[PDB]
Design a protein around this ligand. Structure first.
Ligand code: UQ
Ligand code: PLX
Ligand code: PEE
Ligand code: NDP
Ligand code: 970
Ligand code: SF4
Ligand code: SF4
Ligand code: SF4
Ligand code: ZN
Lengths: 115, 144, 156, 176, 63, 208, 342, 96
């Protein structure tokens, strides 16, 4: 029951199919992105980052949430392909000027009060 | 006629105190008009009017060549005008400070300062409040 | 020394030419640009100081940031700043450009354009009047007068 | 109640046709435009000789902020914080404590001039005419830090501009 | 058409909040206490959600 | 009651009430509520499934003729199970009138795009999607319109913080503009202004 | 720690790191990166400059409001050094010129100025001093640059016993002289190399690695009196290095041997330029001298830095040196050069 | 009522002067420190106490609408003087 209306997919199988299609499109786009934006990363780095972004949301079990995630990923792909994005936008995925924040207890205790 | 305009030009060069004063005003303000001296400044600026000029060109100041410490023969700016002549010059009032002096207070600056930005006299912001948390001072004597 | 006198005179001549011929990029972001227009209008007539607008960043000496700089716009401002040949100057005009102003606490506003580019003159106001912007421009001219590149080079 | 801006029909008579042919071939309206520009060439320009000549202003003009005093030299501000509450840009920062003589006075009074929108709401809100927007507008700085005003800077502005500020207030307070 | 989703509602991956501000945060859900300086009770009618207090420090300039 | 109080207009109030009754009778399938505000504004609260029929009726009916879409927006009310309130404002030139149509949705439920009914909606629906995250089905080209490229989250939502989560600055080492977690030199100061004494008795709620 | 100097915040732009640093030589290649890394964390940075203030403009956006303070200084004046190090707990020295000017020889910039800085900062109570010398610093080296570096290193150690001395080797970066210098040679036609560059081994180090190493050495309590050597992860023969540089830039590589005396004569001819020389005799000596191996000194991995290989950062320096035809070529297309490691 | 700290820095009306070990003093080197020289506490301490022949006096700071809100000061205590909470002026009844 729970009486919900879908966006595109009726169960997780169709949602997974759409996820795979979007992943294929991003995988094909990465080399062109590296060429056009004149990025100093490799194609391997770009595809690894695409996989990491996809795996960030691997725990989702709602087909509607997956449909919205695919819609957002398609929005980002359309944005990248048309060059609406600049090199700064593409490089924002890699956080190159962010100092690594530690995760163990002792370093956090040393730096400050935040957990 | 044209000849009367030329005569106006010659009386304009004659009216600035000779050829060298004419050249001084031309190279100092890029203007050679003659107006009635409304007044002078305690810093040397002179203030003139000419009510026959259109609104905007009917009041002007010939700045001093020597402000507080700096040479202002070429380097002048609008911040050198003191507040009373500032009120008259920007047409906030019709009455000059000579005929309508401002009210006297003992905390008002007796010496106007110009824009001191980019100069060792510039303003540097800082916190004006005192310390909030006081730390414990350990005793100066050994504990054993 | 004769060499020091020569470099001082050449320094003055170059400084004089640059201050006299300041070409700002035709570039406006928001409300402040309107007052910029009023600086070019008959009443003030910036052209009489040798100050003429030119659209191309390659033919520009000064960038006037006249308006809010949002996050979406910051890369473009940085890009057209980088395409200015040197020497180049930046005049920050208005509260928005100076520090964010009315939109300082926004998710989409850069809190001051000096985070993106180096700024020479900060013109306060919201908007600054055309007269205040003209005062800032003449202050930039005075600052250019004080530069001594040749004297510094000779001393090296 | 409306009028038409482009609903007029051209006359078809031979005289009208010949006049339009003369307009087309001999460029009469273009000479009209040339005449208009030539007319403007011989007018007096509306330019003013800045900085020698200034633009007109009003007693209500909003400029650089200043903190004022009573004629005794005592500060007017009592740290009610109404200016800090009303400020739409949150440009005012205030800290207060009892003075050594028990007076209610500020220990911190900052205005961030790069946050300020120069609306004048604070001088409306002030119940003792302590904070004002003075007449000055020529205070461009070379660094951002010079535009972060503390209490000393604002008290200095008041001391420097009191003569004109009081005369401006006298000319406008009956409209307030 | 209805698809009968069975799972608990979860929108974290769509909100765009960084994960640090999703996992390490604690919210308080409460009806605010009446201000003891006054007798009006109109500020004690609705429920409030507010986050835990984090570090505040002093700006080196201007304090 | 004369000089400082806004005057009333009962004729327009009656006309709008009658027309609201008219609309409700014609479309019982979707119309849930009809209201006439005290300053003579007519609002029709409908079911989401009736977005396209209702508007179409209101655009094409001879007695309606609201051929112009003045505005379309969303309001976020977190306490409601359906978070978002979709508001259409329509103007009729033939009858010199205005109408408001309201519906509701939540985060995961699409609304039918009304570009077919009104061409003006395109950018309005894009803006609602960008600011609130409400998806519109069968939209010709749905993408962000106001926010920066790659911006995560929806700013107009009540939960989103006023200054957001990231800021921008130019970094010389990478020679480009970078996005970093927001740090503020001065925190926005939250004011508590609400008076503890009730202002308007006419709106008092039952004590539950 | 003097409560005002207690670290606060999340280590960002508006935070307080507890560092107050005076960076001599901040208007150079390494100085901009050092000031950027200091201002990222919210440090108070004092920049002494003798150049035209225009030339410091690029350092203005590196800090928050009030976090970067610019002050005029004179290298021959010790009252000026006192003025600029009075309130700092860290002093970093990056002063150095590749060529010798009329008013400053190598011994002035590498012995007198570093010693004066060390003496005055020790007198003023500065807690930490970081000095930069070269990896190849030596008392009897053929280059007077390196002889002066070694003498100044000893002088600094004598004037500030707890100073951290860092010895990098051929920093490469966008503004780096080293990658650019080889790139510059293409205009002439042929690349002149002594012995065809088959008798020289280089171990270049990335600029960001050196800046991070300096920053970490500041925050390291046990790096006080230590001496570090900052070197890259790979060693190359000069011939292979220049060939790789020309392959990344997509320029035709035409190397030819040039005898030592001819190259010295060319350097002397280029030395008479009143402006920045294209090359000098000292530069010719330093280019064709193999990088030393100092396994007994702590390295970047002792400061927590993983050295960046040149293969990963060469394109960001050399894409500017390409023509329009090859401007969009990817990074992994150039077949990394041959390393002579052990 | 200006006075310098042992470091040579002027002390403001607020009383804040940077401590000897405070690095922030570096912001004033090669520049100056803004200090307002007219101390209000000292200037109000010079005004003469006004003697009035009534138990309750009124103060509005002078200037009518240009002063402060009008307040009424009780003058029954003879061990002290009535002080305006807005302007700082002092009032007393003729005593002894
Ligand atoms: C990054 O740093 C550097 C620079 O900065 C920008 C340089 O300019 C620089 C030198 C710059 C060169 C391009 C100067 C060379 C001069 C031209 C290429 C002309 C050379 C050819 C002849 C002089 C002209 C006629 C040809 C004859 C064979 C006849 C070097 C080496 C450098 O390293
Ligand atoms: C054969 C020739 C080859 C070379 C040709 C080059 C062109 C010849 C040089 C022409 C020079 C003319 C420019 C100098 C004019 C100066 C104008 C003067 O008014 O400037 C004053 C100051 O003068 C400058 O400080 C010095 C200018 C000249 C310096 C020396 C010039 C020496 C020229 C030598 C030529 C060498 C050529 C080398 C290449 C062969 C200050 O004015 P300023 O403050 O702005 O005014 C502001 C506006 N106000 C006044 C209304 C407020
Ligand atoms: C007995 C036998 C004699 C032989 C015959 C002699 C008599 C000839 C009579 C006709 C002569 C006419 C000559 C003019 C040629 C051009 C006329 C023309 O038709 O051009 C216009 C357009 O020409 C222009 O108006 C030019 C536009 C740009 C104007 C720029 C500045 C205007 C000129 C300023 C003054 C010119 C001064 C010139 C003389 C300088 C001295 C050397 C047509 O364009 P439209 O109006 O759009 O209509 C056509 C399509 N429907
Ligand atoms: N490959 C490399 O880059 C290596 C560098 N090093 C050392 O690291 C340090 C940084 O090098 P790098 O950034 O490349 O050097 P740069 O030439 O880029 O910059 C040197 C800085 O020192 C200043 N300076 C030079 N001479 C004087 C002087 N006589 N008086 C005052 N200031 C002066 C310069 O100021 P101004 O802007 O006024 O000229 C400049 O800011 C140097 O000491 C260098 O010897 C060591 C090993 C390798
Ligand atoms: C060139 C002259 C004589 C005037 C006109 C002018 C400027 C400077 C800048 C601009 C400009 O006009 C263009 C076109 O019209 C607007 C209208 C704008 O808003 C009304 C606006 O705000 C950013 C910007 C612009 C352009 C703009 O940047 O000086
Ligand atoms: S500073 Fe004021 S006038 Fe200028 S762009 Fe911003 S809001 Fe508009
Ligand atoms: S003028 Fe307006 S923005 Fe500025 S301080 Fe006053 S109230 Fe705030
Ligand atoms: S300036 Fe006026 S409004 Fe602001 S705190 Fe002082 S008395 Fe109150
Ligand atoms: Zn009083």
């Amino acid at each position: 029951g729970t009486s919900v209306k879908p966006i595109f997919s009726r169960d997780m199988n169709e949602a997974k199919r759409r996820v795979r299609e979007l992943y294929r499109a991003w995988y094909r786009e990465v080399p062109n992105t590296v060429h056009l934006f004149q990025l100093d990363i490799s194609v391997k780095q770009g595809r690894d980052k695409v996989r990491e972004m996809f795996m960030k949301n691997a725990h989702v079990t709602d087909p509607r949430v997956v449909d919205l995630l695919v819609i957002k990923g398609k929005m980002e792909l359309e944005e990248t392909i048309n060059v609406w994005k600049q090199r700064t936008h593409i490089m924002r995925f890699f956080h190159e000027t962010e100092a690594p924040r530690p995760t163990d207890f002792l370093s956090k205790f040393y730096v400050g009060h935040d957990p | 006629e044209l000849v009367q305009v030329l005569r106006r030009g010659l009386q304009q060069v004659s009216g600035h105190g000779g050829l060298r004063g004419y050249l001084r005003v031309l190279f100092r303000a890029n203007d050679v008009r003659v107006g009635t001296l409304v007044g002078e400044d305690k810093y040397g600026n002179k203030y003139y009017e000419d009510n026959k000029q259109f609104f905007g060109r009917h009041r002007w100041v010939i700045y001093t060549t020597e402000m507080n410490g700096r040479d202002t023969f070429w380097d002048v700016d609008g911040s050198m005008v003191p507040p009373e002549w500032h009120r008259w010059l920007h047409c906030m009032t019709d009455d000059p400070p000579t005929t309508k002096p401002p009210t006297a207070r003992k905390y008002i600056w007796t010496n106007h300062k110009f824009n001191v930005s980019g100069t060792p006299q510039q303003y540097v912001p800082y916190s004006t409040t005192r310390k909030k948390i006081q730390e414990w001072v350990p005793p100066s004597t050994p504990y054993k | 020394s004769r060499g020091e006198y020569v470099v001082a005179k050449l320094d003055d001549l170059v400084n004089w030419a640059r201050r006299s011929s300041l070409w700002p990029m035709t570039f406006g972001l928001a409300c402040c640009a309107v007052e910029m227009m009023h600086m070019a209008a008959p009443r003030y007539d910036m052209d009489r100081f040798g100050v003429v607008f030119r659209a191309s960043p390659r033919q520009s000496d000064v960038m006037i940031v006249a308006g809010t700089l949002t996050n979406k716009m910051a890369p473009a401002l940085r890009k057209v700043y980088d395409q200015m040949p040197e020497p180049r100057y930046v005049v920050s005009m208005g509260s928005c450009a100076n520090g964010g102003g009315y939109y300082h606490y926004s998710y989409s506003v850069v809190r001051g354009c000096d985070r993106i580019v180096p700024v020479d003159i900060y013109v306060p106001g919201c908007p600054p009047t055309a007269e205040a912007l003209l005062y800032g421009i003449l202050q930039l001219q005075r600052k250019i007068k004080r530069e001594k590149r040749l004297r510094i080079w000779y001393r090296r | 109640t409306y009028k038409f801006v482009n609903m007029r029909e051209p006359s078809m008579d031979m005289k009208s046709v010949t006049d339009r042919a003369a307009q087309t071939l001999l460029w009469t309206e273009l000479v009209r435009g040339l005449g208009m520009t030539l007319s403007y060439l011989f007018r007096e320009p509306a330019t003013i000789n800045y900085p020698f000549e200034k633009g007109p202003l009003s007693p209500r003009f909003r400029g650089e902020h200043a903190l004022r005093r009573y004629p005794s030299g005592e500060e007017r501000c009592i740290a009610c914080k109404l200016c800090e509450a009303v400020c739409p840009a949150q440009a005012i920062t205030i800290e207060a404590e009892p003075r050594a003589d028990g007076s209610r006075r500020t220990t911190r009074y900052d205005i961030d001039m790069t946050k300020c929108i120069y609306c004048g709401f604070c001088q409306e809100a002030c119940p003792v005419d302590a904070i004002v927007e003075g007449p000055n507008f020529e205070f461009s700085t070379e660094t951002h830090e010079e535009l972060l005003y503390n209490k000393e800077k604002l008290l200095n502005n008041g001391d420097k501009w009191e003569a004109e500020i009081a005369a401006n207030i006298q000319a406008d307070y009956l409209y307030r | 058409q209805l698809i009968a989703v069975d799972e608990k509602l979860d929108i974290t991956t769509l909100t765009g909040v960084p994960e640090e501000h999703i996992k390490t945060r604690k919210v308080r859900i409460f009806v605010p206490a009446r201000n003891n300086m006054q007798s009006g009770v109109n500020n004690t009618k609705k429920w409030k959600m507010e986050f835990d207090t984090r570090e505040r420090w002093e700006n080196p300039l201007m304090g | 009651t004369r000089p400082t109080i806004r005057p009333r207009n009962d004729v327009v109030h009656k006309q709008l009430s009658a027309f609201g009754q008219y609309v409700a009778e014609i479309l019982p399938k979707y119309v849930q509520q009809v209201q006439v505000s005290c300053f003579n504004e007519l609002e029709i609260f409908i079911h989401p499934d009736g977005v396209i029929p209702v508007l179409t009726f209101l655009r094409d009916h001879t007695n309606a003729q609201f051929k112009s879409l003045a505005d379309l927006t969303a309001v976020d009310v977190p306490t409601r199970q359906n978070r978002f309130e979709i508001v259409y404002n329509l103007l009729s030139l033939r009858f010199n009138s205005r109408i408001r149509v309201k519906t509701y949705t939540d985060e995961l439920t699409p609304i039918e795009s009304s570009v077919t009914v009104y061409k003006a909606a395109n950018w309005y629906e894009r803006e609602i999607w960008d600011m609130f995250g409400v998806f519109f089905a069968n939209h010709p080209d749905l993408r962000r319109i106001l926010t920066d490229y790659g911006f995560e989250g929806h700013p107009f939502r009540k939960d989103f913080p006023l200054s957001g989560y990231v800021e921008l600055r130019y970094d010389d080492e990478v020679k480009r503009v970078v996005a970093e977690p927001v740090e503020l030199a001065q925190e926005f100061r939250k004011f508590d202004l609400n008076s503890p004494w009730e202002a308007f008795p006419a709106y008092r709620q039952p004590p539950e | 720690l003097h409560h005002a100097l207690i670290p606060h915040g999340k280590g960002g732009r508006s935070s307080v790191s507890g560092i107050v640093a005076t960076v001599f030589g901040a208007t150079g290649f390494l100085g901009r990166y050092v000031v950027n890394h200091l201002g990222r964390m919210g440090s108070q940075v004092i920049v002494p400059y003798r150049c035209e203030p225009y030339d410091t403009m690029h350092l203005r956006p590196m800090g928050d409001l009030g976090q970067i303070i610019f002050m005029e200084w004179n290298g021959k004046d010790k009252d000026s050094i006192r003025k600029v190090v009075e309130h700092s707990n860290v002093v970093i020295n990056l002063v150095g010129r590749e060529w010798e000017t009329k008013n400053f020889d190598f011994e002035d910039v590498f012995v007198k100025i570093p010693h004066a800085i060390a003496q005055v900062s020790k007198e003023a109570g500065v807690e930490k001093l970081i000095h930069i010398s070269h990896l190849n610093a030596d008392i009897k080296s053929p280059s007077r640059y390196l002889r002066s570096k070694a003498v100044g290193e000893k002088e600094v150690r004598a004037a500030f016993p707890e100073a951290t001395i860092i010895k990098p080797s051929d920093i490469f970066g966008r503004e780096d002289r080293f990658l650019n210098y080889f790139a510059s040679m293409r205009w002439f036609g042929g690349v002149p190399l002594i012995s065809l560059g088959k008798e020289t081994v280089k171990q270049p180090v990335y600029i960001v690695d050196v800046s991070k190493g300096i920053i970490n050495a500041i925050k390291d309590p046990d790096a006080k009196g230590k001496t570090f050597a900052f070197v890259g992860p790979n060693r190359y023969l000069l011939f292979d290095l220049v060939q790789y540089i020309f392959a990344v830039a997509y320029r035709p590589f035409l190397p030819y041997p040039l005898p030592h005396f001819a190259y010295r004569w060319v350097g002397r001819l280029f030395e008479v330029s009143p402006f920045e020389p294209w090359t000098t005799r000292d530069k010719v000596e330093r280019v064709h001298m193999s990088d030393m191996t100092l396994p007994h000194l702590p390295g970047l991995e002792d400061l927590g830095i993983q050295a960046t290989p040149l293969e990963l950062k060469a394109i960001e320096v050399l894409r500017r040196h390409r023509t329009y035809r090859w401007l969009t070529s990817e990074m992994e297309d150039v077949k990394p050069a041959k390393t002579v490691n052990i | 009522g200006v006075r310098t700290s042992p470091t040579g820095e002027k002390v403001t009306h607020t009383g804040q002067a940077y401590d000897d070990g405070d690095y922030r003093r570096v912001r004033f080197s090669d520049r100056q420190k803004e200090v307002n020289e007219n101390f209000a506490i000292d200037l109000i301490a010079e005004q003469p106490v006004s003697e009035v022949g009534s138990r309750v006096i009124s103060c509005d700071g002078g200037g009518g609408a240009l002063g402060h809100p009008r307040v009424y000061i009780n003058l029954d205590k003879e061990t002290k003087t009535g002080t305006c909470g807005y302007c700082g002026l002092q009032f007393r009844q003729p005593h002894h």
